[PDB]
Amino acid sequence: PMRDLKIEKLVLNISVGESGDRLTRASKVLEQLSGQTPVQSKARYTVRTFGIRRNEKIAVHVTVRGPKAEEILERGLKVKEYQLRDRNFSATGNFGFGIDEHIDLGIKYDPSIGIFGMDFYVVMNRPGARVTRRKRCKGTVGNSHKTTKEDTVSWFKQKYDADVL
Amino acid sequence: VEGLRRARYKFPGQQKIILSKKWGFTNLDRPEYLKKREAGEVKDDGAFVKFLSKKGSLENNIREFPEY
Amino acid sequence: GKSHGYRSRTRYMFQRDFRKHGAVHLSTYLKVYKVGDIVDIKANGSIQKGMPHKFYQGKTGVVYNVTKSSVGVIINKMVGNRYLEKRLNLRVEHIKHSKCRQEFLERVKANAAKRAEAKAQGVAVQLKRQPAQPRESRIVSTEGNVPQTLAPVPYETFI
Amino acid sequence: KSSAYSSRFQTPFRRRREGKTDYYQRKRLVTQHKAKYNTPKYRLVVRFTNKDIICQIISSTITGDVVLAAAYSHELPRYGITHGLTNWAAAYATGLLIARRTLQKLGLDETYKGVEEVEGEYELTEAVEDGPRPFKVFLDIGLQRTTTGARVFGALKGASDGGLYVPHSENRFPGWDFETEEIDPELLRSYIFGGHVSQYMEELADDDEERFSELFKGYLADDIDADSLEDIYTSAHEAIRADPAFKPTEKKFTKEQYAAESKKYRQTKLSKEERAARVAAKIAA
Amino acid sequence: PRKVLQLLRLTRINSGTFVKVTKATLELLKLIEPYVAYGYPSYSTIRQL
RNA sequence: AAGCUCGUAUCAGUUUUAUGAGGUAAAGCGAAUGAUUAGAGGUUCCGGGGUCUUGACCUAUUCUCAAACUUUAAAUAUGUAAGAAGUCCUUGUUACUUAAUUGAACGUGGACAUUUGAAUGAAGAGCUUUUAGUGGGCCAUUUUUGGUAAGC
RNA sequence: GAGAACAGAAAUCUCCAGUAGAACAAAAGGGUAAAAGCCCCCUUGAUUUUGAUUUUCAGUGUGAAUACAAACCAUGAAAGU
RNA sequence: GGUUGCGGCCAUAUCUACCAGAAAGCACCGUUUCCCGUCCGAUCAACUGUAGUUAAGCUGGUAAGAGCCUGACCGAGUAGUGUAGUGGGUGACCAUACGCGAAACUCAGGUGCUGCAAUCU
Ligand SMILES: [Mg+2]
Ligand SMILES: [Mg+2]
Ligand SMILES: [Mg+2]
Ligand SMILES: [Mg+2]
């Protein structure tokens, strides 16, 4: 009655190799694709193999909530043609997938911007998840109220009319 | 017994050879081990054995030691 | 060379008890100390301020001064062939009330009560403690308790 | 979890495990200057739950905390306020109630009357020359986050206006802008008499009507418009200053009658004899 | 042990004193055990001493 | 050595009663950390040969250890207390403290005698001035470091 | 540990478990989890005047440290520090 | 007796897996004009108690549960140790005399108690 699955948030991640004009150019698309200003991430350490160093500002990402996240998810599922493997589903009830280009969603090519891929990840939960997030009397979710892999897969099949390999 | 006697010459000081009343390398007496084995309280794991206690969950002590 | 720092050789003395780390319970800060109280010293390792020197660990003294968060304690220290008085400024976390005399006050109260009740009736109030006395004569019965004979056991190995 | 992990685990304090008490803040709130001996320190405990506000005056003891006076927002309907028992103006009324109630019990209600001409002016309770000093309490917000315009400082404003001496600054009241170092008395006065709720009712009604019926439905049923709650808050303040004494709600049933009802729905533990029977029966199954 | 012997007034060999038997005095006797001989006097022994 | 102030007075290389402090001996490793023997049952789209072995881990066990490891933890040594400078009742002082004669400290006045607050002892207790020599040590039982050991 | 285009043992993103097995300029030992760690905001008390106390100790000095008094400040809604 | 606010001792209170919960309370939950804070009204802030739900939190119970606590002439007066001898033994070490006295192990029982204020078949 009050344990219906729902989308907590949708985070879009673009892992850029380096910083500079390349990273901020990739940050441009997320501004109008999600209607929110994204945030950038800096590398934890230095490898000297992938081409990054400490605090090099290598990545950019943004998360969205509400029905707008569902609209972006719908437009992102057209690339996969409502088809995902048996994988991509976590044991905690979350699922995600990645794409190779962003223009297919409807974004104009804009040679001044270029071509980028994106990572989509969806976090599923049930009403009452505030108990783990609230400051006072912070607690844990009961076992029967937790989201499992099977429940998310079944929920993913009843809607979107999609199939799992 | 003769094998341990020959080993004494390699050691300084005095050593004694004692026939233990335990069953092998277990800490149970010779007749006590017979009682537990015939009651189905002994299970073999590798070269040693595991015993059954009166403690713990029944669902774990029933799958093990089915004979008891 | 040798090392004689302030907290030398205090590896175990200033440790917390097992499964007793963390913050101090509030009853430590709610106790009231007044000049003349007898207190004992036990340093708390989690409070680095107002910490007594390792010599005074386990010593008992008398409060002579009370401050905002600390008290002043009088300690007699044996130096050479004489005793010298030492004054310590210690925070309340490192001290507690001494029970060596709280029980003595109870006997003082009890002596007066027994002194007063005997004042009207009986002479020889007898308000002095005595050590343990030798046992008096008694009779031991064997009804259902017949003595059982014991003997030394022979030597065995059972290894 | 392994057996070694459980054996070496140190459990926090019970109040810390439940997540209600901040012991870092409590130590500094409760500890008293040791040269003041048994002088109590009084906290103004203000806690906000759903559809309820609680205000208490509490001192500390070894056995436990002791309540000197208490006030609840659900007692407001006896003074005039029946809607919005958790808003900013409700906190002000509850804060005023606990201030007047505490002073009357101590006997200092004639002195330190407070202010009866509130207009959002920041001022402390000054002591009277050649007379007793005002009763002093310290605000205890618990785990509440300090933000300007929050309701917890609304109860602070009411208690200070009620005659109690509470030390505070004005930079956390509504109407303070970080750009300049001053307060706006007009905006603060608006929040005291529910100005922020009145403006919403006017604007919500002129924007959509299905929401103005879903919300504020109690106001429409009892015939209160958006320019009348100004007076009822003023009437409530005068009523509180008239009879601030506490009157308990009449008990329909006695305590022992309540106990008999509750024991019927409470499950009891088993004896050691019947625990052994369950094991024996389970073995034979 | 030297201090206990002084407190019992035994400062030279073949000296003797009477001691009341309590818990406070039985612990004194155990400290000087390898230096003294003691027992339970009789009436004749006390009279002749 | 010279004494001085006093003389029942408090003291004591001691015990007892009450109440503290400690991390050594021992003990422990299917308790943490670090060493360490042996198999057993599982686990890989994630080591490597080979169509099934050897390593890695995980689970329940097993043998043996620690001056610079430890949950537990002695014996012997060690702090304080056992009253007149004490306990109880009433109320005087203050610029300190309290919302407040509230509290804190120091007092006035009244009551309680030496089975007056455990044991034993007490060539009396307390105190001051001044100055000599000495400032190479060594031996024994027990504890113990370096060293094969030493009358080291 | 389970998940996400390039992406792999190690790039970034998400969830779960996690008594500290991390971190706290340095040697080592203590101490610390709504913190003493990480990030952010505001600051100069790392200030003025002289005494008492602890450690080494002759109860000298030096070094270091502890608790107050009388001022003047910083921070916070505040108790406080 | 149930519940809430503030606590005291800080596992008999923790952890794992299940089950139950009348009334009130608590909670989840609804909304974004205003104060306020964010990449995101998720956290934080404000507004309504209205649209809903006991699903979770929460409380209680169950388990030859893990852990924890208490006790025992359980192990054990064992290990260790103060004191003594012109005691034993080449030695290493050990026995006895007067005293003190463990830990592991085994077994049994237990699974929060309680102070202040308010409220409820
Ligand atoms: Mg705080
Ligand atoms: Mg040591
Ligand atoms: Mg040892
Ligand atoms: Mg001799």
Numbering used by the authors:
A (entry chain LO): 8 to 172
B (entry chain LN): 149 to 216
C (entry chain QT): 2 to 160
D (entry chain LI): 8 to 292
E (entry chain LK): 99 to 147
Sentences from the paper on this structure:
In this study, we investigated the expression pattern, structure within the ribosome and effect on protein synthesis of the ribosomal protein paralog 39L (RPL39L). As obtaining pure populations of RPL39L ribosomes from mice remains challenging, to analyze the impact of RPL39/RPL39L on ribosome structure we turned to the yeast, which has only the RPL39 gene. We complemented RPL39-deficient yeast cells with either mouse RPL39 or RPL39L, and analyzed purified RPL39 and RPL39L ribosomes. Ribosomal particles from the WT yeast strain Sc60S, the yeast RPL39 KO strain rpl39Δ, yeast rescue strain rpl39Δ-ScRPL39 and the mouse RPL39/RPL39L-complemented RPL39 KO strains rpl39Δ-MmRPL39 and rpl39Δ-MmRPL39L were studied by single-particle cryo-EM.
